[PDB]
Amino acid sequence: LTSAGKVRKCTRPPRGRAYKRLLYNKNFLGPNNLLIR
Amino acid sequence: MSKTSGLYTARKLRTVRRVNRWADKKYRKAHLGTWLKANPLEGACMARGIVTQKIGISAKQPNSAVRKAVRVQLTKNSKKITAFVPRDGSITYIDNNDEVLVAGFGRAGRAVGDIPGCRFKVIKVAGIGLLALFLRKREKRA
Amino acid sequence: EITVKVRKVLNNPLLQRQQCVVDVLHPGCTYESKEAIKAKVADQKNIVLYGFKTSFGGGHTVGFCNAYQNMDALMKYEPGFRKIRCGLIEA
Amino acid sequence: PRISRHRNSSKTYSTPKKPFTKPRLDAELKLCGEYGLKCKREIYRARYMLAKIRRTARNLLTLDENDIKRRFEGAALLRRLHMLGILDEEKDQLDYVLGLRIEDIFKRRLQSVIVESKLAKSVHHARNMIKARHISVGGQIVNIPSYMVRISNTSRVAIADTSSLA
RNA sequence: AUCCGGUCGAUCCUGCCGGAGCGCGACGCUCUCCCCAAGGACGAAGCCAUGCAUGCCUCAGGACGCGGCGGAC
RNA sequence: GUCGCGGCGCGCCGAGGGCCCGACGCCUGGCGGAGAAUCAGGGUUCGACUCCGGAGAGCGGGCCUGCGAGACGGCCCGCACAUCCAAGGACGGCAGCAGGCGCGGAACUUGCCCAAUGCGCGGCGCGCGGCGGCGCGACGGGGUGCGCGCGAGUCAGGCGGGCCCACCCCGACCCGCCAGGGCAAGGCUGGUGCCAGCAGCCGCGGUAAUUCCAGCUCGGCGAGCGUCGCGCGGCGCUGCUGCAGUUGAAACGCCCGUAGUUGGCCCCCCGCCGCCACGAGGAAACGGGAGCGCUCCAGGCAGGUUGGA
Ligand SMILES: [K+]
Ligand SMILES: [K+]
Ligand SMILES: [K+]
Ligand SMILES: [K+]
Ligand SMILES: [K+]
Ligand SMILES: [K+]
Ligand SMILES: [K+]
Ligand SMILES: [K+]
Ligand SMILES: [K+]
Ligand SMILES: [K+]
Ligand SMILES: [K+]
Ligand SMILES: [K+]
Ligand SMILES: [K+]
Ligand SMILES: [K+]
Ligand SMILES: [K+]
Ligand SMILES: [K+]
Ligand SMILES: [K+]
Ligand SMILES: [K+]
Ligand SMILES: [K+]
Ligand SMILES: [K+]
Ligand SMILES: [K+]
Ligand SMILES: [K+]
Ligand SMILES: [K+]
Ligand SMILES: [K+]
Ligand SMILES: [K+]
Ligand SMILES: [K+]
Ligand SMILES: [K+]
Ligand SMILES: [K+]
Ligand SMILES: [K+]
Ligand SMILES: [K+]
Ligand SMILES: [K+]
Ligand SMILES: [K+]
Ligand SMILES: [K+]
Ligand SMILES: [K+]
Ligand SMILES: [K+]
Ligand SMILES: [K+]
Ligand SMILES: [K+]
Ligand SMILES: [K+]
Ligand SMILES: [K+]
Ligand SMILES: [K+]
Ligand SMILES: [K+]
Ligand SMILES: [K+]
Ligand SMILES: [K+]
Ligand SMILES: [K+]
Ligand SMILES: [K+]
Ligand SMILES: [K+]
Ligand SMILES: [K+]
Ligand SMILES: [K+]
Ligand SMILES: [K+]
Ligand SMILES: [K+]
Ligand SMILES: [K+]
Ligand SMILES: [K+]
Ligand SMILES: [K+]
Ligand SMILES: [K+]
Ligand SMILES: [K+]
Ligand SMILES: [K+]
Ligand SMILES: [K+]
Ligand SMILES: [K+]
Ligand SMILES: [K+]
Ligand SMILES: [K+]
Ligand SMILES: [K+]
Ligand SMILES: [K+]
Ligand SMILES: [K+]
Ligand SMILES: [K+]
Ligand SMILES: [K+]
Ligand SMILES: [K+]
Ligand SMILES: [K+]
Ligand SMILES: [K+]
Ligand SMILES: [K+]
Ligand SMILES: [K+]
Ligand SMILES: [K+]
Ligand SMILES: [K+]
Ligand SMILES: [Mg+2]
Ligand SMILES: [Mg+2]
Ligand SMILES: [Mg+2]
Ligand SMILES: [Mg+2]
Ligand SMILES: [Mg+2]
Ligand SMILES: [Mg+2]
Asked if residue D5 is part of any domain, the answer here is no
D148 CA: nearest nucleotide by C1': F296
Distance of CA D141 to the CA centre of its chain: 19
Question: Is D46 within the bounds of a domain?
Answer: yes
Number of structural domains chain D divides into: 1
Instruction: Provide the CA D19 distance to its chain's centre, in angstroms.
Output: 24
CA distance to D51, D53, D60, D66, D92, per residue, from D63 (Å): 19, 16, 5, 9, 17
Resolution in A: 2.8
Q: How far is CA C79 from CA A11, C56, C85, C90, in A?
A: 78, 31, 11, 13
What amino acid occupies position C75?
M
Q: Which residues pair with B100 in a beta bridge?
A: B49, B125
The answer to whether A5 contacts chain B (CB < 8 Å) is yes
Record: contact D162-C56, CB cut-off 8 A = no
On whether residue D1 sits in a domain, the answer given is no
Nearest CA-CA partner of D63 in D77, D50, D80: D77
**CA D56 – CA B131 distance, rounded (Å):** 49
Closest CA to C59 of C22, C21, C36, C25: C25
Please report the domains of chain C, with CATH numbers, ordered by start residue: 3-86 (3.30.70.3370)
Centre of ligand 25 from the C-alpha of residue D7, in Å: 28
Nucleotide nearest to D6 (CA to C1'): F50
B89 vs A8: CB contact, 8 Å cut-off?
yes
Domain assignment present for D86: yes
Q: What's the domain range around D46?
A: 19-166
- d(C-alpha B114, C-alpha B97), whole Å: 27
Q: Are the C-beta atoms of C2 and C54 separated by less than 8 Å? A: no
Give the distance (Å) from ligand 48 centre to CA of residue D132: 9
Q: Note whether C28 contacts D141, CB cutoff 8 Å.
A: no
**Residue D15 contacts strand E, CB under 7 A:** yes
10 Å CB burial of residue D57 (0-12, 13-18, 19+) is: buried
Amino acid (1-letter code) at residue B89: G
Report if residue D9 sits inside a domain: no
| Exposure string over B14-40, b if 16+ CB within 10 A, otherwise e | eeeeeeeeeeeeeeeeeeeeeeeeeeb
d(CA D36, CA D122): 10
**What nucleotides of chain F have any atom within 7 angstroms of a protein Cβ?**
21, 29, 49-51, 103-105, 115, 129-131, 138-151, 157-163, 168-170, 175, 178, 180, 184-188, 190-192, 194-201, 203-206, 212-214, 217-223, 227-231, 237-241, 243-245, 251, 260-263, 285-291, 293-300, 304, 309
Judged by CB atoms within 8 Å, which residues 126-145 of D form the interface with C? Answer: 133, 136, 139-141, 143
Choose from D133, D141, D143, D159 for mutation: most chain C CBs within 10 A: D141
Residue D11 maps to a domain: no
* In a domain? residue D134: yes
Give residue D44's Cα distance to chain centre. 12
Please state the domain extents for chain B: 1-142
